[PDB]
Amino acid sequence: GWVKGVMIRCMLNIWGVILYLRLPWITAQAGIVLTWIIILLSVTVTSITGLSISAISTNGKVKSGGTYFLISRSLGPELGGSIGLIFAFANAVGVAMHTVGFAETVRDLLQEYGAPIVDPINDIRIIAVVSVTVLLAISLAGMEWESKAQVLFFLVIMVSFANYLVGTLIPPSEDKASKGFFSYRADIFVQNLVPDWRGPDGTFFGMFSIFFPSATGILAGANISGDLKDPAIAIPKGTLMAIFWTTISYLAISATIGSCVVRDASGVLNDTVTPGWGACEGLACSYGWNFTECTQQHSCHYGLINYYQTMSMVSGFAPLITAGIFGATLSSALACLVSAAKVFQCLCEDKGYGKNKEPVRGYLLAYAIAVAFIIIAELNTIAPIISNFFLCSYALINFSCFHASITNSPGWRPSFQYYNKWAALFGAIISVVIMFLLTWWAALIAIGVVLFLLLYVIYKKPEVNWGSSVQAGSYNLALSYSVGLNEVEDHIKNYRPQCLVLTGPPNFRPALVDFVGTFTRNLSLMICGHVLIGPHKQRMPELQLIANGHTKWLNKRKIKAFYSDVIAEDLRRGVQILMQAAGLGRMKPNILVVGFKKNWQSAHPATVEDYIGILHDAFDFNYGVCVMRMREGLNEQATTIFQSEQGKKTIDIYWLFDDGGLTLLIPYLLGRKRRWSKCKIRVFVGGQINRMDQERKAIISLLSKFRLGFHEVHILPDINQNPRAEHTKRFEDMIAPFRLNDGFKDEATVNEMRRDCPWKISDEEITKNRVKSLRQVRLNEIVLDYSRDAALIVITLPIGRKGKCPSSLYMAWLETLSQDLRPPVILIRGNQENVLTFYCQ
Amino acid sequence: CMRTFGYNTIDVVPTYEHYANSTQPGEPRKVRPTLADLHSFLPVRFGWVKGVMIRCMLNIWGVILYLRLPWITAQAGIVLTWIIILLSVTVTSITGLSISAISTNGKVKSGGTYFLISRSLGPELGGSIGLIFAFANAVGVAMHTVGFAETVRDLLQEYGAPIVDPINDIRIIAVVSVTVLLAISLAGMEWESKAQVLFFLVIMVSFANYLVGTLIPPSEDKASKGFFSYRADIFVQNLVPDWRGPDGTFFGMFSIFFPSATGILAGANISGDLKDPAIAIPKGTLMAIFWTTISYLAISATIGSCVVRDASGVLNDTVTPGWGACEGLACSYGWNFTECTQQHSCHYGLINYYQTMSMVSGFAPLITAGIFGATLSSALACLVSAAKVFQCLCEDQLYPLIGFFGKGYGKNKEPVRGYLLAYAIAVAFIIIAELNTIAPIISNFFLCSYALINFSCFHASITNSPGWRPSFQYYNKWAALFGAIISVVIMFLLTWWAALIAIGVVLFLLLYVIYKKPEVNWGSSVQAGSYNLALSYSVGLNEVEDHIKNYRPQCLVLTGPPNFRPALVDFVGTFTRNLSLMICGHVLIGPHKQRMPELQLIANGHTKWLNKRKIKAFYSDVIAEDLRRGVQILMQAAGLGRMKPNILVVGFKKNWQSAHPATVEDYIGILHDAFDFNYGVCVMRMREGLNEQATTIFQSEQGKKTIDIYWLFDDGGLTLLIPYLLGRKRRWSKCKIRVFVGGQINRMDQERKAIISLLSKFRLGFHEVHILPDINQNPRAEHTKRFEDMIAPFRLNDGFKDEATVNEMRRDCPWKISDEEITKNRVKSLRQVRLNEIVLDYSRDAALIVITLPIGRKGKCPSSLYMAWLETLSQDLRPPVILIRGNQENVLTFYC
Ligand SMILES: Nc1ncnc2c1ncn2[C@@H]1O[C@H](COP(=O)(O)OP(=O)(O)OP(=O)(O)O)[C@@H](O)[C@H]1O
Ligand SMILES: Nc1ncnc2c1ncn2[C@@H]1O[C@H](COP(=O)(O)OP(=O)(O)OP(=O)(O)O)[C@@H](O)[C@H]1O
Ligand SMILES: C[C@H]1Cc2ccccc2N1NC(=O)c1ccc(Cl)c(S(N)(=O)=O)c1
C-alpha cells in the first residue's frame, strides 16, 4: 500500500522500475527544469485525483470487499460499470508493460556476461512469455507469503537506494571515466540547464507521455487504498504521504543524476593523448575524452543518452542494484495482476474453483490481454497506452464525482474536509486537455470506446442477476420483458387473439386443445381453464400437486399454454372469475372457446340456462365467442384429427354478417401452418338474383385490399325462400316441450309464471321470432348441398337481445345450424370492431 | 320474396364503407351497430410507364456511358467488364426486390422512401434517415449541374472563345442552369413530365446514331485512328486484360463504375402522385434495371470489336512497301504504328482516347446532346425527390424548428418552401465549384439508405405479425439480410473516413430522436417484437419444472385508485423493484357486470400515471358487490403460470371506532381469508392517514435514524427479509438496524448462543441485539383502563347465558363479543397492552418499526375484539409502523 502499493510496487508504477531503469535517460535528454516541470504536472494531476478518490471513498461505514464495490455503492452502477471496465483494461495493459520491462532488464543483466542465446529482440519475448506464465502458475500460491515478500522487497529497495546514493557520487577514476562520471562540476550543471534531443520522440510531450506511465500511486490511492484496518482516517493520510514521498524522492534522484553524470563517453579505456598531440578539449580536458568524430557520427557507446542504464555502472554494488530493481518490478507486476484478477472476481464474486471459488477465468483473460500486448516488447511505444488509459479512468472518476456532488445524488453527502466540487471540475478539464494533447487519435479512440461501453452496458435487461441458476435466470428474463411490454401502446396492425379455452381437465377433451394450439403456436396467448365444483376451504397440499401433474401432461405434448384452476359453487361463477381476473398487464385474453353441449335435451333446463348465461356474460365483458362442435362429442396419449395432414380439401366460410373480420382472420392464420397450407378456401355471401354480377366483383375487390389470398367467391340469392315442409316440422317438435302456453296475456301478467322456470317461451314471443327461426333452418339446407366433403366449416353466429330471447329458443337455433354433418363446425362472432385494415398510417 | 339479404333485420351485411376511414362524395358516413345495440335490454395521376420507369431509367443513365465505359473496356477486357456489371446488378436487384416487397402492405401515401421506411420500421430510425436523405438529394442536384457546366465549358473552349478562365465560367453557367431548372420545377408536374420525355427522346436518338455510325466502312481519318468495323481478330484480341498506369486494377475499375448505377428510387419518391402505387412501383423499377443493364452490356460488347488499342492518327503512316516494319494485326489491313507503340507515346486508340464513342458515330453533336440530356435529367430528378421528402418529413413534427416548411399550395400541395430551400443550398454549394472532396460523403449516405431499406424488410419478415401480409411474394429474408451486410461492407471498402463520418451522423441523429420521445404511434415491427419476447420468455419460464430454490416476495397491494394512497405504492416499490412481481388492486362495486369504453380509458390512464413515476407494477380492476368478494377474486385468479402473488399488503382502517360494524367485520374477514389462502400478510399504518405529482416521506432522505425490529415468533424469516432488503438502497444505507431479538417468545427462544446464529445466517450485518423477558409483567393499570373503554361498546353482557343460546343473538349482530370469551381471552389480551409499553420507550425516534402481527383462530375470537388488539399494539407512535407474519416457508433460498 505504501511501498508495495505506493512506493515500491507502485514505485515501478510511480517512481520505480519505470523510473529506476529509464528515468535518468529522460532526465538527461530533457534537463533539470523540464523534468521538474513534468514531475510537477504529473503530481498535480495525481493529487487532484487522489483528493477526489479519498473524499468519495470515505462516505459511510466501510465493508471491505473491493474498491470497485465501494465505488459502485457510492456513485451507483451506471458509472461504476464503466469505471470497472476502464480499470480492468488499464490494469491488464500495465501488467503487460511492467512484465516486459522487467524481462528486458533481466535479459540485459544476463547479457552483461557476454553470452547470447537466441537474439536481441526475440530472447526478450521468450523471457517475457516465461515470466508471464510463471505468474499465471503462481496465481493462487499463497496469501501471507505475499505480505512477507512485500516487507522483504521494501527493505531490499531501501538498501539498494542506499547503495545507489553511496556509489553515485563517483570521484575521478579511470573506471568511472570509462562510463563518463566526473563527480560534481558547475559546467555540468550549466550543460544540464539547457535542452537537447535525439530520436523520433525528441519532443517534450514525449517525455510527458513516458513519465505519465509511472504515476500509479493515485490509482494506488484508488485501487490499492481499500486495505486499511481503520477505514475512518486511514485512507487519505496514506494517499498524501505516499504522494509527497514519491515527489520528493523523484526530485532528489533527478538532482543527483544531473549533478554527478556526463553526457558523453569514450568507448576505449586508454583513449588519452598529450598536449598538442591529438584532439583534446572541453571539460574532458580534465580527463581527456574527445568525441568530436564520436559526437558527429552518433558515436556514443556509453553516455547519458548513449546507454540506457547509467546507474548500474554508477553504483558500487551492481548485483545489489540489479536484484533490488528486479524485485521491485516483479512486485509491481504481481500487484497489478492481483488487482485485475480482483476486479474480475468481484464482478463474478457472488464458476467457482477451490475454496475461495476465485474466478480463474478473469485472471486467465488478464493473462491473455497482457500476453497479446507484451509480444511487441518495447517500452517506448507501450507506455503511452498505459498513460492514456489510466488518465481516462481517473478523469471519468473525478468528473462523475463532481457531477454527483452538483446534482445532489439521493444519498451523496461525503465527509471530506477538503473536498470541493470546483476542484473536481478543474481536474476533469485539465486531465481531458492533457489526454487530448498527449496523442490525438489514440486518446480519441479510447474515449469513443469508453463512451460505447458507458452507453451500451446499461440496457441489458436483467440488471441484477440474483441467485445464479437456471430457474433464477429464467425468472429474471421473464420479469424484465413482461414489465417492459407495459410502455408499448396498441395498434390495429398488431392485433392478436388471446384465447381462454374451457377444457376442464385437459385429458378429457384434447380436440379443443389441439385445434387452438394449431393456430396459436408461437403467435399469441393460450389459457386452459378448469373450475372445481363444490364448497371447500381451498389451500391444502394436494391441489398444487394436481396442478403440477396437469402442467406436466400438457408439457409432454409440446403445447405452449398455461393451466389454471379455481374453486366455485357452479361453472358460471368460476368462468366469471376467470374472465375478470386472469392475466398480466397487456397479456390478457379477449376470446372465449367453449365446446358444444351434445346432450342438451335429456338434461335439467337449469343446466341449459347456465350454459346460455355463460355466453351472455362473455358478450357483456366485450369478449369474442367461439363454439366448437364435433359429431362424436369432445369428452401413450390419445391421437386426434388435427395431428394428421389434411390434403387438398377445402375450407368453407359463410360470412353472412359483419363482425369486424374475426370470421375471416381465424382461417387465415390456420392455413399459414404446414397442415392447412394445401386447402383451397371458399367464401359464401348472400345477395340478389337480379344483381348477382355486380356483387361477385365487389366482394372480390374488398378481399384483395385485406390481402388475404383467398381463392373463390360464391353468391347465394335464395336465403329468404321457404324451407321444406318436412324440415320446418322438425323444428317444432324440438321446442315442443318448452311452450309455457301463455301467449294471450299481458307481458306484465307473464313474468310471475316465469319466476320458477325462467326458461319457457310465450305464445306471443313465438309470433315475433317466427321469421328469424325459419331463416335459421333454411341455412342448414344450403350448407348440406355445398359442403358435404370439406375439412372445416365456419359460420357466423347469431345474436339474441337479452330479455327477449329465452334460453330454450336460443339453444334451439345453434342445434339447427349444425346438424347431420360430419362437423368440425366452428361458429364465430367478433365484438363489432375492426380487426383488419388496408391502411398504413 | 326476391329482396336483398338484410332488409328484415337489424344486422348489416359487409361493405367497403365500414372499414374506410375517410370522407367521400357521400357525405353521411355509415357504421355498423355496436355490440350494445344488439345485446342488452331496452389530381393529375400517372401510370407506370411514364411515372416510374422513365424516371428511374433517366436517373440510372449518366455520363460514364459516353466518356468512360470504352476506356474501362479497353483496360480490363470484355469479360471483366461483364463481371463488374453483373456484381453491381446483383446488389441493385436485391435492393429493388426488398423495396417492392415492402411497398405493398396497405395504401401508401406521399413521402416516398421515408414514408415506407418509417411507417414499416418505426419513427426513430426513419427521422434520421429522412434528414440525411433529403440533404443528399439536395447536394446531388448541384453535383450534376456542375458536371453539365463542365461539358458546356469544355465544348466552348474547343471552339476557341473563352471568357475568363476554367474556374469562373463554370460558376456562371452553373448558376444560370440551376435557375432554369428551378423555374421549370415550379410550373407544375405536367411541364415537369414533358421535359423528361423530351430528354428520353434525345438520348434514344443519340443511341441510334451511334449504332448506325458503327457500321459504315472506314474513311481515311477513321482508319488512321483505329476504327476498322467489326473484325473477328480485334474481338479475339480484346478479351484478355491490359492494365496500364496507377489506376490499372480490378478494384480501381469497380470503384469507378459502381456509383454509376444506383439511382433506382427516383420513381418511388413521387409516390404520392401515382395512380395505383402497389401495381406501379415494382414493375417500373425492375424493368428499368433490366433495360439499363442490357444497354450497358451491348455498348461494351459492340465497341470492344471495332477499335484497336493504339493509333498514331497521322494520315501519312500508311503501309507502303519499302519503308517501315509492320507489327500487330494493324498491318494486316494496311497500317503501320511501330514507332509510337515502340516508344509508347501516341495519342489515339481505345486505351488512350476518351471521346472515341463520338468519333466512331456519324455526327458528334448528337453525342453532345446525349450528354446534356443525361446530366439535366439527373439534376431534375434529384431536386424533385428532395423537395417531396422534406415536405413529408417536416409534416410529422419530429424536430423543433424545421416545422415551418410543409405549407402546401393550390390544388396539389406544392412545397415552394422546400423548393426554395433546396435551390439556395444548391447555389451555395455550386459556388465552390470544387467538390471532389464532398462526393464520398453523399455516396455513403445513399448506401446507408440502401442498408436501412434492406434491414427493414428482413426484420419485418422475421417478426411475422398477423398484420404482415404483402401481396408481392417473390423475395426472401436471408437475401435481404445479406444485402444489408454487403452494403455496409462496400461502404467501408470504398473510402473509410467518409464511412466513419456517415455512420457517426446516423448514430447521433438516432440518439437525439430516441431522447426526444416522439408522440406518435403507427404500428411497427419493434412493438410486435416486444410482445414476441414477452410471450416467449413467459413460456420459457413456465416450461421448467418447479423447485424450492427460487423463493421471491410477490405482492398484491390493495390500493384502490393508485393516485389516492401513494405512500403504500412507494413503500412496496422501494423493495420490489428489479426483483419480484408487484400488482395493484382496485375493486369497483358496480350493480351487475359490464365493461364499457370508460373503464378501458380509465385503466389506460392509470397505467400511464403508474409508468410516469418509475414504478414497475400492473394495475388491475374488478367489479363486485363488496370489497371482500373483489379481493377474493383477485387472490383466486390473478397472475400467469409461475408469476403469481403470495403476499397481501393492506392499509389500516383508522376509523374503525365510528363505522357500521359490518365494515370492520368485512375487514377482518379479508384478513382471515388471506390467512386461510396460505398467504403472508402486511398491515401498514400511519399517524396522519393514507388517503404535479405529490411527494411522500418514502421518497426523501433518511440520514442516520435507526430501524427497530421486534421478533417474537419464528414464521420463516419474512419478518426479517423485508427490513433487510430495505437496507441495501442508497436512501437507507446510513440507517442503523437494532434487533430486539426476544428470539422466540412463544417459539422456544434461544437464550444467548443460537440467537446470534440465525441472524448470522441471514447475512444481515446485524449491529445490535437486546432482550425483553418482561412480557408477563402486569402493565400499569392506567393503560389497562384505556383498553376496557374501547371494548365497552361491543359488549353483549351475556354472562348468565348458556353457550348454546349465545349463538342465537349473533344471527343478526355477529360482531358483538360474548362474556365467556372475555374471561377466556384475558391473558393473551394483557401482552398487547404491556408490549405497547416497551415500544413506546425505545423507538420514539426510529425511522421504521416492525412487529410480529398477532393472529386469531376462526370462531374462537370475536371480530371486533381482534380489531381492538391491533389498535392497542400500534398507537401513539410517530413513525410508520409495519406488522408482518410470514407464510411459514423457508425464505433462505433467495440468497446466492
Ligand atoms: N369443469 C369444467 N370446467 C370448465 N369447463 C367445463 C367444465 N365442465 C364442462 N365445461 C364446458 O362445458 C362444455 C360441454 O358441456 P358438457 O360437458 O355438460 O357437455 P358434454 O361434454 O356432453 O358433457 P359430458 O362430457 O358429461 O357428456 C365443455 O366443452 C366445456 O367447455
Ligand atoms: N376499492 C379498494 N380496492 C382495494 N383496496 C381498498 C379499496 N378500498 C379500500 N381499500 C383498502 O382498505 C384499507 C382500509 O380502508 P377503509 O375504507 O376500511 O378505511 P379508511 O379509513 O377509508 O382507509 P384509508 O384512510 O387508508 O383510506 C385501505 O388502506 C385500502 O388499502
Ligand atoms: C451522388 C450524385 C453524384 C453522381 C455521380 C454519378 C452518378 C450518380 C451520382 N449522384 N447520385 C445519385 O444521383 C443518386 C444515387 C442514389 C440514389 Cl438512391 C439517388 S435518388 N434520386 O434516386 O434517390 C440518386
CSV table of C-alpha atoms in Angstrom, one decimal, chain B residues 122-359:
chain,number,residue,atom,x,y,z
B,122,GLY,CA,-40.5,3.0,-36.6
B,123,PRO,CA,-40.1,6.7,-36.2
B,124,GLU,CA,-36.7,6.7,-34.5
B,125,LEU,CA,-34.6,5.5,-37.4
B,126,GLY,CA,-36.9,7.0,-40.0
B,127,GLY,CA,-36.3,10.5,-38.8
B,128,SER,CA,-32.6,10.5,-39.2
B,129,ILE,CA,-32.7,8.5,-42.4
B,130,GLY,CA,-35.1,11.1,-43.9
B,131,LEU,CA,-33.0,14.0,-42.8
B,132,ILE,CA,-29.8,12.7,-44.4
B,133,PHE,CA,-31.7,11.5,-47.5
B,134,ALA,CA,-33.0,15.0,-48.2
B,135,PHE,CA,-29.6,16.5,-47.7
B,136,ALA,CA,-28.0,14.0,-50.1
B,137,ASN,CA,-30.5,14.7,-52.8
B,138,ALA,CA,-30.1,18.5,-52.4
B,139,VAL,CA,-26.4,18.1,-52.9
B,140,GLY,CA,-26.6,15.7,-55.8
B,141,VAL,CA,-28.5,18.3,-57.8
B,142,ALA,CA,-25.5,20.6,-57.6
B,143,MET,CA,-23.1,17.8,-58.5
B,144,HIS,CA,-25.0,17.0,-61.7
B,145,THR,CA,-25.3,20.7,-62.6
B,146,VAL,CA,-21.6,21.3,-62.2
B,147,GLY,CA,-20.9,18.3,-64.5
B,148,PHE,CA,-23.1,19.8,-67.2
B,149,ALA,CA,-21.3,23.1,-66.8
B,150,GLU,CA,-18.0,21.4,-67.3
B,151,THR,CA,-19.2,19.8,-70.5
B,152,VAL,CA,-20.5,23.1,-71.9
B,153,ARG,CA,-17.3,25.0,-71.0
B,154,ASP,CA,-15.1,22.3,-72.5
B,155,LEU,CA,-17.0,22.4,-75.8
B,156,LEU,CA,-16.9,26.2,-75.8
B,157,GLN,CA,-13.2,26.3,-75.3
B,158,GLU,CA,-12.8,23.7,-78.0
B,159,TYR,CA,-14.5,26.2,-80.3
B,160,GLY,CA,-11.9,28.8,-79.1
B,161,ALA,CA,-13.8,31.6,-77.4
B,162,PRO,CA,-13.2,31.6,-73.6
B,163,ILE,CA,-14.4,34.4,-71.3
B,164,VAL,CA,-12.4,34.5,-68.1
B,165,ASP,CA,-11.0,31.1,-67.2
B,166,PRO,CA,-11.8,27.5,-66.4
B,167,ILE,CA,-13.0,28.3,-62.9
B,168,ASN,CA,-15.4,31.3,-63.3
B,169,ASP,CA,-17.3,30.3,-66.4
B,170,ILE,CA,-18.3,27.1,-64.6
B,171,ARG,CA,-19.7,29.2,-61.8
B,172,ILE,CA,-21.7,31.5,-64.1
B,173,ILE,CA,-23.1,28.7,-66.4
B,174,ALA,CA,-24.0,26.5,-63.4
B,175,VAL,CA,-25.9,29.3,-61.7
B,176,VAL,CA,-27.9,30.1,-64.8
B,177,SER,CA,-28.7,26.4,-65.4
B,178,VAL,CA,-29.8,25.8,-61.8
B,179,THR,CA,-32.0,28.9,-62.1
B,180,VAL,CA,-33.6,27.5,-65.2
B,181,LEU,CA,-34.2,24.1,-63.5
B,182,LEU,CA,-35.8,25.8,-60.5
B,183,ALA,CA,-38.1,27.8,-62.8
B,184,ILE,CA,-39.1,24.6,-64.5
B,185,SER,CA,-39.9,22.8,-61.3
B,186,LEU,CA,-42.4,25.5,-60.1
B,187,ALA,CA,-44.6,25.4,-63.2
B,188,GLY,CA,-46.2,22.0,-62.2
B,189,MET,CA,-45.7,18.3,-62.6
B,190,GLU,CA,-47.2,18.4,-66.1
B,191,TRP,CA,-44.4,20.6,-67.6
B,192,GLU,CA,-42.0,18.5,-65.4
B,193,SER,CA,-43.0,15.3,-67.0
B,194,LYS,CA,-42.9,16.7,-70.5
B,195,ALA,CA,-39.2,17.6,-70.2
B,196,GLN,CA,-38.4,14.0,-69.0
B,197,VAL,CA,-39.9,12.6,-72.2
B,198,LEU,CA,-38.1,15.1,-74.3
B,199,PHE,CA,-34.7,14.2,-72.7
B,200,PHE,CA,-35.5,10.5,-73.2
B,201,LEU,CA,-36.2,11.0,-76.9
B,202,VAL,CA,-32.8,12.9,-77.3
B,203,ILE,CA,-30.9,10.1,-75.6
B,204,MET,CA,-32.6,7.4,-77.7
B,205,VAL,CA,-31.7,9.3,-80.9
B,206,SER,CA,-28.1,9.5,-79.7
B,207,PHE,CA,-28.0,5.7,-79.1
B,208,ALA,CA,-29.5,5.1,-82.6
B,209,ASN,CA,-27.0,7.5,-84.2
B,210,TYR,CA,-24.0,5.7,-82.6
B,211,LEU,CA,-25.3,2.3,-83.6
B,212,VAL,CA,-25.8,3.4,-87.2
B,213,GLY,CA,-22.3,5.0,-87.3
B,214,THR,CA,-20.6,1.9,-86.1
B,215,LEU,CA,-21.3,0.1,-89.4
B,216,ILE,CA,-20.1,2.0,-92.4
B,217,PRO,CA,-16.6,1.2,-93.9
B,218,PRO,CA,-13.9,3.4,-92.5
B,219,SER,CA,-12.7,6.7,-94.1
B,220,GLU,CA,-9.1,7.8,-94.0
B,221,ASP,CA,-9.3,9.8,-90.8
B,222,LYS,CA,-11.1,7.0,-89.1
B,223,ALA,CA,-8.7,4.4,-90.5
B,224,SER,CA,-5.7,6.3,-89.1
B,225,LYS,CA,-7.3,6.3,-85.7
B,226,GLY,CA,-8.1,2.7,-85.1
B,227,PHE,CA,-11.6,2.2,-86.4
B,228,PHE,CA,-12.0,-0.8,-88.8
B,229,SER,CA,-15.5,-2.1,-88.4
B,230,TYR,CA,-16.4,-5.4,-86.8
B,231,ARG,CA,-13.5,-7.8,-87.2
B,232,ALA,CA,-13.2,-11.2,-85.5
B,233,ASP,CA,-9.5,-10.6,-85.0
B,234,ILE,CA,-10.0,-7.5,-82.9
B,235,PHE,CA,-12.7,-9.2,-80.9
B,236,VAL,CA,-10.3,-12.1,-80.2
B,237,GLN,CA,-7.6,-9.7,-79.2
B,238,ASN,CA,-9.9,-7.7,-76.8
B,239,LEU,CA,-10.8,-10.4,-74.3
B,240,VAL,CA,-7.6,-10.5,-72.2
B,241,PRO,CA,-6.9,-7.5,-70.0
B,242,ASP,CA,-4.2,-4.9,-70.4
B,243,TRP,CA,-3.6,-2.9,-67.3
B,244,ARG,CA,-1.7,0.4,-67.5
B,245,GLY,CA,-0.9,3.2,-65.1
B,246,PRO,CA,-1.5,3.9,-61.5
B,247,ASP,CA,-5.3,3.1,-61.9
B,248,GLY,CA,-5.0,-0.3,-63.6
B,249,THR,CA,-6.5,-2.8,-61.2
B,250,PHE,CA,-9.8,-4.6,-60.9
B,251,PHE,CA,-10.6,-2.7,-57.7
B,252,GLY,CA,-10.0,0.6,-59.4
B,253,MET,CA,-12.4,-0.2,-62.2
B,254,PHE,CA,-15.1,-1.5,-59.8
B,255,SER,CA,-14.7,1.7,-57.7
B,256,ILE,CA,-15.1,3.8,-60.9
B,257,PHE,CA,-18.1,2.1,-62.3
B,258,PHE,CA,-20.2,1.1,-59.2
B,259,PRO,CA,-21.7,4.5,-58.4
B,260,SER,CA,-22.8,4.9,-62.0
B,261,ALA,CA,-25.9,2.7,-61.4
B,262,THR,CA,-27.6,3.4,-58.1
B,263,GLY,CA,-30.4,5.8,-58.7
B,264,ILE,CA,-33.3,3.4,-58.6
B,265,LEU,CA,-35.6,5.3,-56.1
B,266,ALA,CA,-36.2,8.2,-58.5
B,267,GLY,CA,-39.8,7.0,-59.2
B,268,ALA,CA,-40.9,5.9,-55.8
B,269,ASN,CA,-40.1,9.3,-54.3
B,270,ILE,CA,-43.1,10.9,-56.1
B,271,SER,CA,-45.3,8.0,-54.9
B,272,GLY,CA,-48.0,10.4,-53.8
B,273,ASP,CA,-48.7,11.3,-57.5
B,274,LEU,CA,-49.3,7.7,-58.8
B,275,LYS,CA,-52.5,6.0,-59.9
B,276,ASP,CA,-52.0,2.7,-58.2
B,277,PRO,CA,-48.6,2.6,-56.4
B,278,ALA,CA,-48.9,-1.1,-55.4
B,279,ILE,CA,-49.1,-2.1,-59.1
B,280,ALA,CA,-46.8,0.7,-60.4
B,281,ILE,CA,-43.6,0.7,-58.3
B,282,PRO,CA,-42.2,-2.8,-58.7
B,283,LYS,CA,-42.8,-3.4,-62.4
B,284,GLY,CA,-41.4,0.0,-63.3
B,285,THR,CA,-38.3,-0.4,-61.2
B,286,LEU,CA,-37.5,-3.9,-62.3
B,287,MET,CA,-38.0,-3.1,-66.0
B,288,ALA,CA,-35.8,0.0,-65.7
B,289,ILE,CA,-33.0,-2.1,-64.2
B,290,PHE,CA,-33.2,-4.8,-66.8
B,291,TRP,CA,-33.2,-2.3,-69.7
B,292,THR,CA,-30.2,-0.3,-68.4
B,293,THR,CA,-28.2,-3.5,-67.8
B,294,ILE,CA,-28.9,-4.6,-71.4
B,295,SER,CA,-27.8,-1.3,-72.8
B,296,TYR,CA,-24.5,-1.3,-70.8
B,297,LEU,CA,-23.6,-4.8,-71.9
B,298,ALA,CA,-24.5,-4.0,-75.5
B,299,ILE,CA,-22.3,-0.9,-75.6
B,300,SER,CA,-19.3,-2.8,-74.1
B,301,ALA,CA,-19.5,-5.8,-76.4
B,302,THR,CA,-20.1,-3.8,-79.6
B,303,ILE,CA,-17.3,-1.3,-79.0
B,304,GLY,CA,-14.8,-4.0,-78.0
B,305,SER,CA,-14.7,-5.2,-81.6
B,306,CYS,CA,-14.2,-2.2,-83.9
B,307,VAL,CA,-11.3,-0.2,-82.4
B,308,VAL,CA,-7.6,-1.1,-81.9
B,309,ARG,CA,-5.9,-0.2,-78.7
B,310,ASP,CA,-3.3,2.2,-80.3
B,311,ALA,CA,-3.3,4.5,-83.3
B,312,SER,CA,-0.9,7.3,-84.3
B,313,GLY,CA,-3.5,9.4,-86.0
B,314,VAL,CA,-1.3,10.7,-88.9
B,315,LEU,CA,-2.5,10.1,-92.4
B,316,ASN,CA,0.9,9.5,-93.9
B,317,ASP,CA,1.7,6.4,-91.8
B,318,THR,CA,0.0,4.1,-94.3
B,319,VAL,CA,1.9,0.9,-95.2
B,320,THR,CA,3.7,1.2,-98.4
B,321,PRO,CA,6.3,-1.3,-99.5
B,322,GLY,CA,9.9,-0.3,-98.6
B,323,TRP,CA,9.6,1.9,-95.5
B,324,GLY,CA,8.6,0.7,-92.1
B,325,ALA,CA,8.4,-2.8,-90.5
B,326,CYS,CA,4.8,-3.6,-89.6
B,327,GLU,CA,3.7,-5.1,-86.2
B,328,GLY,CA,0.4,-6.3,-84.8
B,329,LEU,CA,-2.7,-7.0,-86.8
B,330,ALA,CA,-3.0,-3.3,-87.7
B,331,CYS,CA,-0.6,-4.2,-90.6
B,332,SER,CA,-3.0,-6.8,-91.9
B,333,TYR,CA,-5.4,-4.1,-93.1
B,334,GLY,CA,-2.5,-1.9,-94.2
B,335,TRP,CA,-1.4,0.5,-91.4
B,336,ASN,CA,1.8,1.0,-89.5
B,337,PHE,CA,2.1,2.1,-85.9
B,338,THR,CA,5.5,0.7,-85.0
B,339,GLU,CA,7.0,4.0,-83.9
B,340,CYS,CA,4.6,5.1,-81.1
B,341,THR,CA,3.8,1.5,-80.0
B,342,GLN,CA,7.6,1.2,-79.6
B,343,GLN,CA,8.1,4.4,-77.7
B,344,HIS,CA,4.6,4.3,-76.2
B,345,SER,CA,3.8,8.0,-76.9
B,346,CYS,CA,0.9,8.3,-79.4
B,347,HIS,CA,-2.4,9.9,-78.5
B,348,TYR,CA,-5.0,7.7,-80.3
B,349,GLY,CA,-6.5,4.3,-79.8
B,350,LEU,CA,-9.1,2.9,-77.4
B,351,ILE,CA,-6.9,3.0,-74.3
B,352,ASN,CA,-5.5,6.5,-74.9
B,353,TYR,CA,-8.6,8.4,-76.1
B,354,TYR,CA,-11.7,9.5,-74.2
B,355,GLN,CA,-14.1,10.8,-76.9
B,356,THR,CA,-13.8,7.6,-79.0
B,357,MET,CA,-17.5,6.8,-78.9
B,358,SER,CA,-18.2,10.2,-80.5
B,359,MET,CA,-15.6,9.7,-83.2
